[PDB]
Design a protein around this ligand. Sequence first.
Ligand SMILES: Nc1ncnc2c1ncn2[C@@H]1O[C@H](COP(=O)(O)OP(=O)(O)O)[C@@H](O)[C@H]1O
Ligand SMILES: [Mg+2]
Lengths: 70, 70, 75, 371, 188
Amino acid sequence: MDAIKKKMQMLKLDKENALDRAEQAEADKKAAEDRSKRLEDELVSLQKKLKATEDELDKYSEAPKDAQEK
Amino acid sequence: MDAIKKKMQMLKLDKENALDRAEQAEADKKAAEDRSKRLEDELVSLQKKLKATEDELDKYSEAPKDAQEK
Amino acid sequence: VPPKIPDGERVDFDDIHRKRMKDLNELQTLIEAHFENRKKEEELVSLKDRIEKRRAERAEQQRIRTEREKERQTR
Amino acid sequence: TTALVCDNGSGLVKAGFAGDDAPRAVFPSIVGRPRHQGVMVGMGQKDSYVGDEAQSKRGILTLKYPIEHGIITNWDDMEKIWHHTFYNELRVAPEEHPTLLTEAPLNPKANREKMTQIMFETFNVPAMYVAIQAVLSLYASGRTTGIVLDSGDGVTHNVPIYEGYALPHAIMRLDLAGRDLTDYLMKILTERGYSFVTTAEREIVRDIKEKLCYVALDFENEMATAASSSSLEKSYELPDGQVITIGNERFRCPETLFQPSFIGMESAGIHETTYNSIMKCDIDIRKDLYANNVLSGGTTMYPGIADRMQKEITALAPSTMKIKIIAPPERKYSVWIGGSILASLSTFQQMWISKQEYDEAGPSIVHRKCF
Amino acid sequence: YLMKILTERGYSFVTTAEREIVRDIKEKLCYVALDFENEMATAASSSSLEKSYELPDGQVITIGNERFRCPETLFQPSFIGMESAGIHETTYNSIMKCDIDIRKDLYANNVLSGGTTMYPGIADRMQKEITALAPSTMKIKIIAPPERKYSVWIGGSILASLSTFQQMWISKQEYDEAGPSIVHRKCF
Ligand SMILES: Nc1ncnc2c1ncn2[C@@H]1O[C@H](COP(=O)(O)OP(=O)(O)O)[C@@H](O)[C@H]1O
Ligand SMILES: [Mg+2]
């Protein structure tokens, strides 16, 4: 008939809307998770640099006792 | 007829699938955003303590320099 | 000199929204028209059933009358 | 008062008052003089049947369209069509109504100037404005960006727009449209035995094209399938009986859009002129144009074109961009719906070409600020 | 651009073969206006500019103010949508990037070459534009030899005929030893 065709059109328009929203949400989620894992790597690097600076501080804290002994 | 019923049902099913997929992606995005915010808030303090360690190293290196040159 | 559009304010993506909103209204009016139309047209099937009863009775009447005329004519 | 949103088009004149959803009167734009002699006296035979009246008496007329490719080639017939549209299909005198005509891009100036001169002198309207047929189709979609491919019946043009700023250097106008597809279908039907020659039978071939033809998703596979099985052969009943069976002519007629070499045209199909029109745009608005490709016009109503075009552009475009093709169900009247929306705006109410302005600068006012 | 503005009168050239016809029209008819606005005003009132031209099959065409609008794109690249400045201002910018002591010599020895600089009346428009841009004291001179089109090739012949240049060629044995990347090396 005619109205059945209108119902068929409507039942696909909302499908297209949902698919578009799903694609947008997937892209946003992937971008956010990539940024989060990059920040995780940044935090690991910062921890490593803190450890290295603490090592250098341990060296220049060992030096003063020998210096006083000198 | 027959094909109309199953076609409409399949369209509705796929619309619901897209909706749930978008909801899941939104939840993952919220989780990633929270993780990123928490990571940054503590990474700033990590950088601050790294700078404090660096300044401590600077002074604990200035002292042995003078002591050796003393 | 090209046409420089004067200073407006709005709108977008809303009049299309309200125009597409009445799809449900259109579907309802179409389905109502279809239902009432089938209901107000199928009665002609009953009317033609009446036509069939009238033709059946007239055919019986004409068979009887033609037999009567054949009886009354062949002398 | 209310504005008259007329839309000349080429093949179907669509008109109606501003602010509605659909045009009030849609009828073919053909004017056909009778060609035989005529023996009955007092039958009340007129000298020219225009509009939808000449699609019922077409058996003894010689229909001739007054608009060839966007441009108007026969001004007297076009004036007759306009007079019919105003007085008999809408029954509103033009002395009390603004008009909003539509015109294809890159058309000759003289056509537009003559159009405004007619509207101001013969019909004597209060004020008229001429708008490009693609901006309206972009209005109707409710967008503000996007590249619109308006494949009418006369001419196919592809106007890209971003944020409301049209890009005049990226308009790609191609003269292949529905009429050439009708002629090509009428030419390939002769391969089965059916010969249509008369200008009246062109209408029958047009009906065949509308009701049966479809655009194939992949051309070679369809050509191979139609040559082995017989699941495609759809039959159609002429206006007098003698049903005909269309085989692989079904998807070969509208394939001309994507391979204009079929009718001898050099240019590339509508799948590649859109990509070229995009690539002429700046490098930073190509993603938005990729995502908001809009279809309009009558000829884009073939079943299965919104998938073939998307497949082709996805093949051409870079793999990362998302290609989306907007194909609203109200494609045919998209330009007129957009015209109604534009005429109903308050901000637009001072852009009309008022009659006193025309009296002061002549018909060349249309090229001036009031575009 | 000429093929695109011819459509404003009714003449449509689309085929890649008809691009050659439009090129011939451009070569034979177009000229560069000394002052653009005055020419646009004159061509819109009189009809002393409309020159006709016969296509390869008849049907003569009449070019109006398309004559000086096609080559005007050189001085206003905004016509074809290009952002950059015209050939009248990129020369001045190229001069101003040079050192402060050789600007007078460059001002006095501006050279034109190449085919497209053969439009009738360009050596005056360019001089007027640069004189407008440049300081009032410097003398602006534009060298426009009549053999402009083949200027590059004549110079090439002169360079190849020199004795001092005879040892700059990229000899084949050198290419065999260093590969095609030899061209970027000392033998430029
Ligand atoms: N449902 C359809 N399927 C296929 N082709 C169609 C359909 N409707 C119209 N057409 C083609 O489109 C043309 C009408 O296009 P239209 O948009 O009216 O042109 P215009 O831009 O001049 O109004 C007709 O000539 C016909 O060939
Ligand atoms: Mg149209």
